[PDB]
Amino acid sequence: MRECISIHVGQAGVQIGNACWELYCLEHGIQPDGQMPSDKTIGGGDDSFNTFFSETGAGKHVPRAVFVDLEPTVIDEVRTGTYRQLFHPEQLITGKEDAANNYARGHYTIGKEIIDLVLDRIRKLADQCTGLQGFLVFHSFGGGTGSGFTSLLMERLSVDYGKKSKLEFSIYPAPQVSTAVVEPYNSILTTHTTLEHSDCAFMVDNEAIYDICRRNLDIERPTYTNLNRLISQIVSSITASLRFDGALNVDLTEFQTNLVPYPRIHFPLATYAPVISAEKAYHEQLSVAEITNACFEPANQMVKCDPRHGKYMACCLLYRGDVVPKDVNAAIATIKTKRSIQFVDWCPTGFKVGINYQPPTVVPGGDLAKVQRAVCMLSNTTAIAEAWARLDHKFDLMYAKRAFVHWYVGEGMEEGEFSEAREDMAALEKDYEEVGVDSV
Amino acid sequence: MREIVHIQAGQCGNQIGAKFWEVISDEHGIDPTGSYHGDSDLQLERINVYYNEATGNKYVPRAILVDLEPGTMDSVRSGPFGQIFRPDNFVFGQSGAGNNWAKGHYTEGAELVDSVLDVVRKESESCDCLQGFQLTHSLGGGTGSGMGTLLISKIREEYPDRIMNTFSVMPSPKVSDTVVEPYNATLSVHQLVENTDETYCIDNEALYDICFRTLKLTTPTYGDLNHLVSATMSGVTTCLRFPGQLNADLRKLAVNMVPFPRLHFFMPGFAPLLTVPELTQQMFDSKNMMAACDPRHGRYLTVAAIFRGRMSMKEVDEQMLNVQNKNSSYFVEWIPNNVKTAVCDIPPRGLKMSATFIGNSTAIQELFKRISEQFTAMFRRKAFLHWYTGEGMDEMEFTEAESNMNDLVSEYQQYQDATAD
Amino acid sequence: KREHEREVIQKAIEENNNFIKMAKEKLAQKMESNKENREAHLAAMLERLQEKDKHAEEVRKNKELKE
């Protein structure tokens, strides 16, 4: 059992869902129609991949997922895409009118008209679970749906499912692919509203992913397709422990125990390696030491920040492929005596390691090379607060003049909600500052 | 889908309106019969935005043609793509305003307006999800200026939760010898500032200068001016008509362009009149603005730019970054990332590559100051004011309209002098 | 010890229910407050348009009362 229900909200969440679920299928040898020849237990089973896939009597493996967007054009592509047979039509939920890059419309005006339906469809999945573990919510900070509707959903989920764990994969905005000027507003409002209702959130800086595609894959102008295929690999690495089993396999919840010292401090920094082209990876084997050392190159992080100017509260290493503990321990020992790694005084400095012998997988016609081994580091650093700082600065510049605020007020919101949210972010920045100070 | 209901009022409105439909119908690849004969599916991806699909795959423009004189009505029906328009959507009076703002707004138009709303209502009720209305008209006349602003208030009553867009043509003594125009404009602006969400400032003073000084056309016809308008209107609607990401609907455009509700008057631009750096420098040049205003006399609150044709997205991104750095003082710093760029693979007709510009600049006040200067020159003498008061109007409504536009100018000035700290 | 063991698990249930409770109420409060504000904004908008109609009736009336 221990099923995980994925919820994909808005364009970003949906399209990333396509990349993730396409990648999951290839890893588990599941076909686009949902059949899985290697699975002999027809109609059901308690295997590891059943945490993400339910089974029908006809042998179809169906994603435990729901796609939600207040406009249809993005999900319509899923309904007619390569993996259309994969999803039951009720898993794909659409409205007729989007939130127009407005948190208010996504959370109140338009969102309230579909929230009940969504929760009903989620309940239908949850009732198929013999031991539901929690939810995985994919969404953007910038969009009106990803911002507004998500926060509404997270609140409702806390009511309908109590303290059932709820993880986030948040798409932190970047100017290279931004869609709206008010994305800073939507970002702060969602972070504030979702904070009490989220147990752990993995932020993905689009600019970080943008730079990695330009730098490491030599893509002159990365599209959402380029970004998502890279993102899906990080997501796959993080969920690999849930979808597979093994001796040296460590469950994601165990990492989460180390990654969250306090409830509000639940934003781990993700760093993935190796990201390399087929051209460069040819006749070039990246050892365990090389990819592990790459986890401490800030150019490989999912979020733009400098851990070297911050303090570690946790450091987790999620390996997959041809990796053994011996090579890991050696690589870690070398790194500790050569890198700017410093922990806060109130936590142990031991790196927590997990290994999934299942090697990495790549989607056909992709830019990523197929490597024998990969790694994703999940660290809890104070440096991630820089991401909050950059967003909060842009928020303050506009709100000082109350620019674009009328679009929110017109939809029923109050200026008190803006100030309330900003104060919470200010406290959050202060919290990350306090945890770094040495003990008395 | 997401349908837009088009409306064209008055002579000027129907002229540019007809041309607007001629150009995009060619881009989407449909003939005056309403049949599709294109080659790319991208032409029909979002065709429903401006067209109604009828029996036998017949695409009918979701347009409503209006005027207080039946003359222009035959012009459209006789002109090209005249057989494509819906016959019932033709709504015509027998009056003729004669450049009086009161007749169109209170008297003559107030009688014909209901029969227009019936057509608006019939069109709207068949929309899967109506996003709003776009109006083409002039502000110097009587019908387009008067009745055009009446319809807006009336439509906004029945459709208050929809976006109201307008392509307002500004008057200029270089094109029209009509003397009373600065009244109709001011009275129109008094309305547009209150009841529209976004207004493209098409300026005849600018259109004239372009044709004359740049294109080298002495004594330019309206056909010359409209070739600029049609190219402009085709550009600023590209994001609405083809599958895209940036400003794909009227609301998302307004959200990104309008930081304050009253400040929704954009100055469009077009280029050329090449390589990527050339296009980028031209579209930001004052010579290429369809509003007689120098952007270097103020600051950009927001900017939207579309590049059309096959080009390197890398080069476009680098140049758009380059301009913002070299001209950083002309972008308000208290709105980060206020410049957005779009790219459409399909170029316009004739051009291998082009670029359209939409800017919310505080330098727009130069346009409203020109009108205000011409207005007060007439109003101080009460010149021809009896033509207005005779229709039941008051001297106050002229005063209120004047001061309201004076506020708009000062408000554009306020946020121009504003700083981060 | 047995008594304490009961008080702990009872405290866990209490706090969990309180979080669900406060979350449910805090939400219902916001959706209600948002409904009032948005309606009041649309209500005000129409009222200003209603005043334009009334003004137009006064203009047309004023015309025929000058003949």
Ligand SMILES: COc1cc2cc(c1Cl)N(C)C(=O)C[C@H](OC(=O)[C@@H](C)N(C)C(=O)CCSSC)[C@@]1(C)O[C@H]1[C@H](C)[C@@H]1C[C@@](O)(NC(=O)O1)[C@H](OC)/C=C/C=C(\C)C2
């Ligand atoms: C004192 O010196 C004069 C004298 C006259 C005209 C002007 C001047 Cl400066 N000029 C140049 C204006 O612009 C006056 C403007 O009227 C226009 O705009 C013209 C150009 N009109 C109405 C046209 O239709 C174009 C040619 S006729 S095409 C068959 C007055 C300044 O304010 C307008 C006024 C509002 C208008 C005049 C009158 O048209 N009827 C109206 O309803 O109002 C009425 O129609 C029944 C029009 C008659 C024109 C008159 C009063 C002669």
Ligand SMILES: Nc1nc2c(ncn2[C@@H]2O[C@H](COP(=O)(O)OP(=O)(O)OP(=O)(O)O)[C@@H](O)[C@H]2O)c(=O)[nH]1
């Ligand atoms: N990484 C990634 N980011 C995306 C993708 N699609 C959109 N985004 C980002 O999402 C932000 C805007 O949110 P969207 O998801 O597009 O909007 P939405 O959730 O549909 O909400 P609406 O405003 O109602 O349309 C932008 O800053 C984009 O950069 C994607 O496919 N991949």
Ligand SMILES: Nc1nc2c(ncn2[C@@H]2O[C@H](COP(=O)(O)OP(=O)(O)OP(=O)(O)O)[C@@H](O)[C@H]2O)c(=O)[nH]1
């Ligand atoms: N750019 C452009 N401007 C025009 C065109 N036709 C008229 N105008 C302008 O419109 C202004 C007058 O408004 P009109 O549209 O002619 O008036 P109308 O809508 O027909 O209503 P009436 O008052 O009854 O004539 C003048 O200042 C003209 O310069 C046109 O075809 N192109």
Ligand SMILES: [Ca+2]
């Ligand atoms: Ca099975």
Ligand SMILES: [Mg+2]
């Ligand atoms: Mg969307």
Ligand SMILES: [Mg+2]
């Ligand atoms: Mg006319």
